[PDB]
Design an enzyme around this catalytic site. Structure first.
Site, mmCIF file in Angstrom:
data_model
loop_
_atom_site.group_PDB
_atom_site.id
_atom_site.type_symbol
_atom_site.label_atom_id
_atom_site.label_comp_id
_atom_site.label_asym_id
_atom_site.label_seq_id
_atom_site.Cartn_x
_atom_site.Cartn_y
_atom_site.Cartn_z
ATOM 1 N N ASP B 34 0.429 -0.894 -0.259
ATOM 2 C CA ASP B 34 0.207 -0.034 -0.317
ATOM 3 C C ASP B 34 1.015 1.098 -0.282
ATOM 4 O O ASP B 34 1.501 2.058 1.389
ATOM 5 C CB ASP B 34 -0.752 0.142 1.673
ATOM 6 C CG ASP B 34 -1.885 0.916 1.343
ATOM 7 O OD1 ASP B 34 -2.596 1.479 0.900
ATOM 8 O OD2 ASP B 34 -2.172 1.485 3.166
ATOM 9 N N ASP B 216 -1.713 6.009 -4.759
ATOM 10 C CA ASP B 216 -1.939 4.778 -3.834
ATOM 11 C C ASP B 216 -2.064 3.710 -4.456
ATOM 12 O O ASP B 216 -3.695 3.430 -4.940
ATOM 13 C CB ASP B 216 -2.701 5.927 -3.314
ATOM 14 C CG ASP B 216 -2.996 4.731 -1.950
ATOM 15 O OD1 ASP B 216 -2.325 3.919 -2.083
ATOM 16 O OD2 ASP B 216 -4.447 4.912 -1.793
#
Ligand code: NA
Lengths: 6, 323
Positions: B34, B216
């Site tokens: 992540d 992201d």
């Protein structure tokens, strides 16, 4: 879906 | 240092995760890598939440290398949250062995975001300023101990199969065409940078006068400030149904506009096929509103189109047209 940190 | 290839599995084009091994002997987990967070955590035996029941749980009692730390962990995400307790153990990520790594063991995973996720835990890949107290990000340990070949990593998200890939310490040219373009990081916390405009056919539709965005891997959609996103939904013909879902007429795809992000002097187009989720003749918008935040999130919708490089040596994001 998801949205990953604050 | 070495290069590590970490194959990623794609679940519904919405989450991309890989396998890590924790403890001695190794307990296996899937984690979402992540770039929008910096903490590393997995479910554990101490969690009785529903999400912990249908995922792999870490048992520290079975690990000879586990050292408890004692410190609490609490993380809130855009979707989902967790509480846990920090400890140390060895984690292996592909060929890289990362000893004495801080890792959260979950105690609470409330709600159903993680219940219905395919991955067990999260391994954050952003800056230390986004990490919780006492938590050292995995990639920072890898850099500080000289385990990786370069202070960067690269992410390919496959549109047409299960060949997605995280590469630690290198870029792989087989995943892109054209040239890599470098974008400076503005605020070192997320992988954040300035977007100069969003246009359709030369007309500004969003991000008028510039905006901040983050890149992201852990966000499924392309997220933006609600009024800007609503303008985009209108322009592309995405219409809200009775359940709040923004639907697109699949037969319009060849007759819909391309949405163009101007980022540090180069144009990043998203074609209708790129921004439209196409599910057996049922189509929906890949753009999503965020309540009151004004920071854009370029998530998987964007990364599928643009091979993404995250450079900690020089504080840059790199983008190239994906193969
Ligand atoms: Na720099």
């Amino acid at each position: 879906x998801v949205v990953x940190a604050x | 240092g070495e290069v590590a290839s970490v194959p990623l599995t794609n679940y519904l084009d919405s989450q991309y995760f890989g396998k890590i091994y924790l403890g001695t002997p190794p307990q296996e987990f899937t984690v979402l890598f992540d770039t929008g967070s910096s903490d590393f955590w997995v479910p554990s035996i101490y969690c009785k939440s529903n999400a912990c029941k249908n995922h792999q749980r870490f048992d520290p009692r079975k690990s000879s290398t586990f050292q408890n730390l004692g410190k609490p962990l609490s993380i809130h995400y855009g979707t989902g949250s967790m509480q846990g307790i920090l400890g140390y153990d060895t984690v292996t990520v592909s060929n890289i062995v990362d000893i004495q790594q801080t890792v959260g063991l979950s105690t609470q995973e409330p709600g159903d975001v993680f219940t219905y996720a395919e991955f067990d835990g999260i391994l954050g890949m952003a800056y230390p300023s986004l990490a919780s107290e006492y938590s050292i990000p995995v990639f920072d340990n890898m850099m500080n101990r000289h385990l990786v070949a370069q202070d960067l990593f690269s992410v390919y998200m496959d549109r047409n199969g299960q060949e997605s890939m995280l590469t630690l310490g290198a870029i792989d040219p087989s995943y892109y065409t054209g040239s890599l373009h470098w974008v400076p990081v503005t605020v070192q916390q997320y992988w954040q940078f300035t977007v100069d405009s969003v246009t359709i056919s030369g007309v500004v539709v969003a991000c008028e006068g510039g905006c901040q965005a983050i890149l992201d891997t852990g966000t499924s959609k392309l997220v933006g400030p609600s009024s800007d996103i609503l303008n985009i939904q209108q322009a592309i013909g995405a219409t809200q149904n009775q359940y709040g879902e923004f639907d697109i007429d699949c037969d319009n795809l060849s007759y819909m506009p391309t949405v163009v992000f101007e980022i540090n002097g180069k144009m990043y187009p998203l074609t209708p096929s790129a921004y439209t989720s196409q599910d057996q003749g049922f189509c929906t918008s890949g753009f999503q509103s965020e309540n009151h935040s004004q920071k854009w999130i370029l998530g998987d919708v964007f990364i599928r189109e643009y091979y993404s490089v995250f450079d900690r040596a020089n504080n840059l994001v790199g983008l190239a047209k994906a193969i």
